[PDB]
Design a protein around this nucleic acid. Sequence first.
DNA 1: GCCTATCGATGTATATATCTGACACGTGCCTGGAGACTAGGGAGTAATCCCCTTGGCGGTTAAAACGCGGGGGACAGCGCGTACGTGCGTTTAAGCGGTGCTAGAGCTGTCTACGACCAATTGAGCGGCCTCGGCACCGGGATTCTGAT
DNA 2: ATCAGAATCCCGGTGCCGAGGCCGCTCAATTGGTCGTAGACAGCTCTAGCACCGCTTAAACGCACGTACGCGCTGTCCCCCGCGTTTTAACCGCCAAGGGGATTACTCCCTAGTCTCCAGGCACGTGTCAGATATATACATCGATAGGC
Lengths: 104, 105, 97, 98, 95, 94, 87, 83, 459
Amino acid sequence: KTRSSRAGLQFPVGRVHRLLRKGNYAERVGAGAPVYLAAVLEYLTAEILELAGNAARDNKKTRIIPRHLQLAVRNDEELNKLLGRVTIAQGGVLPNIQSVLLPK
Amino acid sequence: AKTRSSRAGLQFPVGRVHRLLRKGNYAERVGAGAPVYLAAVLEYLTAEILELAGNAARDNKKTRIIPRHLQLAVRNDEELNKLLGRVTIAQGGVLPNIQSVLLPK
Amino acid sequence: PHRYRPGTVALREIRRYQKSTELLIRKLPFQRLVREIAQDFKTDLRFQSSAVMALQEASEAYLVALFEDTNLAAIHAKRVTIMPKDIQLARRIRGER
Amino acid sequence: PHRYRPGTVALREIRRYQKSTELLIRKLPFQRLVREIAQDFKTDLRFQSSAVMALQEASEAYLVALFEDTNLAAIHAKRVTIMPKDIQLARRIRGERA
Amino acid sequence: KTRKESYAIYVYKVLKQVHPDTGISSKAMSIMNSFVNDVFERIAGEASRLAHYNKRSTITSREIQTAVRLLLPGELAKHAVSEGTKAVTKYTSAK
Amino acid sequence: KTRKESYAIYVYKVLKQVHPDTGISSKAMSIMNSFVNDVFERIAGEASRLAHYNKRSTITSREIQTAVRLLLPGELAKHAVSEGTKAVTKYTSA
Amino acid sequence: KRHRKVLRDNIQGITKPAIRRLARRGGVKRISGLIYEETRGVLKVFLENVIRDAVTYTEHAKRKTVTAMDVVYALKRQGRTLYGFGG
Amino acid sequence: KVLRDNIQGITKPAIRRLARRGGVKRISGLIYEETRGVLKVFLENVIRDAVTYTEHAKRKTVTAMDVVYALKRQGRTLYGFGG
Amino acid sequence: TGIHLRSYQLEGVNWLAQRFHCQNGCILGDEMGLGKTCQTIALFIYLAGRLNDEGPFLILCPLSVLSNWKEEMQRFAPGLSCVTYAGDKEERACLQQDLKQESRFHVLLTTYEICLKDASFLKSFPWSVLVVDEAHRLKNQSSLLHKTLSEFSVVFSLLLTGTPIQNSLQELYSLLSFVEPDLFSKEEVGDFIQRYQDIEKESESASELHKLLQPFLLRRVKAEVATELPKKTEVVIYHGMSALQKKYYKAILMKDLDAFENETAKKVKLQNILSQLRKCVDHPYLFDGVEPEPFEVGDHLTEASGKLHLLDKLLAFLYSGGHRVLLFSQMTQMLDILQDYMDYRGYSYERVDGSVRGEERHLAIKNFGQQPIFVFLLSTRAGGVGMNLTAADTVIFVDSDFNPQNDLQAAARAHRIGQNKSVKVIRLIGRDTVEEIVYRKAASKLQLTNMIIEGGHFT
DNA sequence: GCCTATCGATGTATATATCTGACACGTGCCTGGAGACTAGGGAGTAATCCCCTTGGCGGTTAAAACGCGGGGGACAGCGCGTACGTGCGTTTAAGCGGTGCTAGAGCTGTCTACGACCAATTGAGCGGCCTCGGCACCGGGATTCTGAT
DNA sequence: ATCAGAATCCCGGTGCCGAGGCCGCTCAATTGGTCGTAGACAGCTCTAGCACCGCTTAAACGCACGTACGCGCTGTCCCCCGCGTTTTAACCGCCAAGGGGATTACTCCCTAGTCTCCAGGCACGTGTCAGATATATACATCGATAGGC
């Protein structure tokens, strides 16, 4: 009976609809808007978690930790574009040394 | 007096400002003091720029302000140049500037 | 015969163009470039003249600012001649990709 | 009498600290500095513990990024030692040094 | 005893679709919650402006769609758009 | 015939206070009009967030004041806050 | 001999003196010959990013003319606010 | 109950660790005082805004949310606190 | 005294003198040709040599005719000091000292672009009279030429045309008011449309229109002058399209294939349709890349256009009949293609085109006289006016026109100051194409206009 | 080897004059701001609870501070030859004044499908509680890099 | 040079406490219904955007020549790095006050909403003088000559 079920989504369409009302984004909200928006948020979540899971497996850890999120983001050009001005706590950096500095 | 601007002693239009706040979806309710305060601030900043532009036009020996004078006025003041740090002005040009290394000897 | 020495005329040009307010690129060539690039995004578009003019104002302003930062990089390296490596350094430090 | 030659252990430090995730500034000294700066804007402030951690995480990330751009500016001059003129260039090109 | 809602359970359900054996630590969940909230604000902000520029009172799926295409890069936008129209089609086909 | 509206006449009346006996070109007037709209949206936008973070329904002069404190540079803010306070305390006496 | 005539590629219409003339306003004294092709690339990247957004507004409105407001909104979204063509 | 001087608590080796994570191989001895100058300017601008939000709320306590909002306003952003 | 040609020229000079004796400007609208230059020279010697007024005269005419105006004056009135203000800026600057500071001229010959660029010098003279040749240029009240010329200090103005009014009443009041604005400014303020009730007086008070114009405009008709009576028979040829252009005509109405991208008939633009359809019926190699190899030479050129297939046959026929011909084109590239065909045929030709210099035009005219050059290639605009081309037997409009009077003006390159022989006019039409529509629309404009312009003095 | 003139060639700033279009200004109109009068719920307030910040103490260690030797990098000086600035004669196409067409932006009028609002009902998801194994950390092995010969 | 010796991985073992499941329940999402307005469609007007010719004239182009700049190489020397020793104070685990943030019940003033009214701001039409354009000055810089000193 839930609108999420009726749409086949995992994310909560009803909650999204309330937030669109309360946020003062516009006078009036159409019935299709929350369904479309929930689908996009679900997609982007799945996109990141897949890469983070691979990084954890490469590191032989069964639980994801913030380091793995940083490695997942900064190695993908399109995620790194989207998150270009975001810092992630306990992230660290990608390993990188300028070739000039290496020994002969 | 009828007009709320003249009760406040302002030149800018308090009623027009109040309307825009209501229509703009900024919040559910707008208190009666907010338009007066906002109109006063906009009037202040307007007067601040025009005085500097007026000096530049007079120094340049012309009676009408033109976009060049606005650019000169903004870029010579440290605070206005910070407030407008990422704005480009049409027909503005640049400040005269040459690095000392490039000058002849 | 008479000649000015190298760089004497360049300094005049700097002082002239920094004083001027003109647009510097020929309008009709620039318009063709804009109308071409648009074809990748939609097959058939008309343009208001003021829309093309706004693009030129923005474009020239962007390039002028880039040359200033480029010049600082060259001076920092103790050169006077700007070179492509200077443009690349500037864009990298500004985070442009 | 054994010594590593100059620059070798400096590379091992780079490989180490790029792999680790820890905070690198000492915590109590940093907290005193935060409280001292706030002392100018209001008297007798109190801080949530996580607020100080948030400030440290943001500050450290800022400086680490700045040293990367500083390193590029030094290499451009064909040097390998960073010097204050490099920082002053980096902050100018970024548009921080208004 | 006071109540504070979050996206946490939905993130965990999606995780178990892509990697059934994997778990996630508490700090990482906080980051994921922040990310979802941040993206929500960006899209809703653009949808609001688009309606205002066109003097339209209602936010609709058209505004969400073009807001998405303005914000996301490259192919990431193309997939996102495909997911949206698919979900709406199912929802309106059902009743 | 389709009616617009703009700030132009109010800008013009302010000009005649700070400098009598001077005029302004229409191009420059357009820039001034554009500037006023920009600053209006910056202030109103931050005032909206301030109300939201504190769960208030109502925008008040106290939100406007704090928005000015955040947006303006360090001394330009001090004069602006004075002008705003002066206007309201006069108005409420009417 | 006359049936047809060649045309130069549109990006090359940004002439060498035009680039020098810009660089002089930037205060550049002396210029290496490689920079002209480097600059054409940088400019082309800039125009593509703005025009792509501008067309996106135009199409959502279901117009066929690109409008000066579309350019202004695109520039503002990318953080390069332009005064003088609208508000 | 009054604080002074402790900017010098940002020690020399602590600054070197930051530079090593940044990949810097050699450091000229002037860099340390230049760095302490830059850090102090950064903190002042953030703390000014965090206090401003705190006063608007009529609180006496600065919170993690006040810091996060201040950072976001400056066009930086920090995931993993608040939010 | 100086020259004699035709008896009606005397009453023309008398009418002109009478209008200036009434102290007003006037319009002369006698048919295309008929020797309006001759009557103008006669007026000048009447002023200078019977009335004995020698105040400076200004003449404006198109670039293609300046040398003819020199020659006719230097033939027929050697007693008048006539000089030409033309050349580079540096040359025209020297002539300011050599002439304007020295005041030894009765007459200046000039052309519109020069008088627009160097106007401030011409303002300095109190002219006796201003003569404007081919005055249709002044039909538009926005034009800077009408503003500047109406501002000059002149005693009187004379406008010359082969046919007044090209479309509509606004052209009439524009021309009319720019001669006497004190009398007619209300007309250009727009009252004349209302007074003549938007031409819904065309037969209800035609006499009102005739009585308005006849005191002020003189116009005499070639059928009324008659005399030599060489005929001017026009024929229209309707022709189809070859398969290549048939594909493209349909594609232009729809969408282009990527085959047409390799042929580069796409990457060219579609934002206007009417132009592209006209090119397609005229010749598909007007599109870039459509000829399959850039080195191509051969009669396939004549097959790719149905027009060229007929024209090749028709030119071969006329050439075998010894008939010389004028070809008028609306488009530059069409003349280029036609000249490629002339080169391929090895035919004898000359060309006049807007890019051709003033000396080259004069040389080409003298070259098309004196010897049997088979064909003249002409732009409809730059080539349409003033010149004697009695050497041709025939005229071909390879492409149609939005205004019929442009074709009449071009056809009047024959018969001016007479012609020895009958002349055929041939019009080529793309059958079942937009060219028929343009032709029918254009004819509709003429069918309105004659009800006005057959009035006036001709009534 | 400066350094001081010298002429003189050139480019830029100045002054006086004439002409023009953009700017201030006045007008008639209308639609949107001011002046009442009303209802009800957002906000201010007093009272209470108890979580969290501040402050202090003792013990142990990790880290910072200090001195030293020496080798590698920053720096200045030099000689070379290339490439890019200045000036000329020739060629091109940008710019402007026309001509003509009709696509498509902008507005009005109608009307019906949609979303806001309401009351009654129900289970999705929240806070509190409990348990087990993924990970940290430790001692001690094997492996692999430096750099002196 | 092949070798010694530091310092990084790799492994098996111990155990702790955070991640994952479960339970009870309450408050917010769902269902079913009415109302009236936003905006979807049809029709119309006429602005202004696209295309071509004709023509002038300044800008772009191609070339020759010479200079001064970019660059590679060298020698000096001083300032940073790598290391051993001594000193400092950060950290951690524990205790204990009480300031302040968070929740509640209550009453009131302020705001949104409605109708009526009329004058502030707009679209328009007009006259004239601030600035643009000419051109005939005056006058500072840049060089070569080449003084001398």
